[PDB]
């Protein structure tokens, strides 16, 4: 479930999505969208971005 | 009951002296360690006495090494060897639990002459 929002439907439904990398221990949350799926997509994208950034950081170091 | 009384009396020590509250008493107790019973002394003020025949007890307070210590002896236990009144105090109460929140010059209890 999401933080605050407004309604009965919102109270019940689990739209928020928290993706996590098991190897790295990185996480990405998303609860911008109403649609779970959309959130997941967004979250997934974020995760992907983060991985790239980590790879770049590693390269730099 | 009568039966219970009978059971109790045959276990009671007969040599227990006439101490009251306030009395500075010195209880000697049996202490096992390894395979040698020895006799540890515990000198303190008698703060409370509970009279129930065989179930009788008494609470001796002292100040060991800065820390206060109460010890409640079962009177007719064989773990206590010898009770002995090192001094006898003048108090007006049956129980001296006010001495728990009193130290040094405040915790003094005047000697009971005669």
């Amino acid at each position: 479930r999401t933080s605050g929002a407004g309604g009965q439907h919102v109270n019940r439904t689990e739209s928020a999505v928290r993706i996590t990398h098991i190897p790295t221990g990185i996480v990405t949350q998303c609860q911008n969208d109403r649609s779970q799926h959309k959130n997941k997509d967004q979250a997934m994208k974020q995760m992907k971005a983060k991985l790239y950034e980590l790879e770049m950081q590693k390269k730099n170091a | 009951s009568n039966i219970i009384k009978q059971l109790e009396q045959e276990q009671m020590k007969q040599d227990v002296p006439s101490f009251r509250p306030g009395d500075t008493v010195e209880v000697k107790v049996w202490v096992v360690e390894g395979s040698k019973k020895r006799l540890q002394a515990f000198e303190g003020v008698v703060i409370a006495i509970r009279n129930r025949g065989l179930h009788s007890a008494f609470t001796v307070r002292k100040i060991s090494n800065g820390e206060g210590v109460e010890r409640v002896f079962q009177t007719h236990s064989p773990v206590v060897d010898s009770i002995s009144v090192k001094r006898r105090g003048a108090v007006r109460k049956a129980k001296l639990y006010y001495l728990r929140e009193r130290t040094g010059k405040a915790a003094r209890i005047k000697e009971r002459l005669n």
Binding site: - | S1, I3, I4, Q11, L54, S77, P78
Partner: protein
Amino acid sequence: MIGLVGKKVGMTRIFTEDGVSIPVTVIEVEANRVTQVKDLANDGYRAIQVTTGAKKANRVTKPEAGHFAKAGVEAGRGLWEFRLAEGEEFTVGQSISVELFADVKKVDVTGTSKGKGFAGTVKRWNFRTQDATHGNSLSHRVPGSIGQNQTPGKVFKGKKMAGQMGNERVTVQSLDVVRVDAERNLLLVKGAVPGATGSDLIVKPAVKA
């Protein structure tokens, strides 16, 4: 093995020579006396019915009297059976003493627990009270929910609720027998047994052992 019917006298303690204070229940096991012997032939099972204590002659009923009379024994305060094991014989008149327990090390004691009357779920079932304050309305010691919604749509059987607590048969097991005394008809057992002072107590050799 058979057991005896005693009476709870009270509790006390036995200081050992070493130092230890053993809390003992004192059970006055007066000489039980057999009133009837059962068997596989007539009754359908082996047992001994015994009686103990005295009873008022004016108060003992005719039927009660007759049963005792047949046995050839004084009327006691009650009758209690004991199932016999294989290789255990008893005549009808025979009087069994606490000397029987001399060899045993542990015993199960059985008697009617003290009656607490109508008890609530905090006492009776150890239910956790609700919050004493922080808004709570008339529901501090109340039992909470008693079921789920539409399924099943009923309270299940043996739901823990308030009700009569105690005044029922209970049995403490594996109580160590501290001392037997044929002189005064006493049995000392370590630790509290059920019931109040003066209550009857069936003492039996421990089944678990």
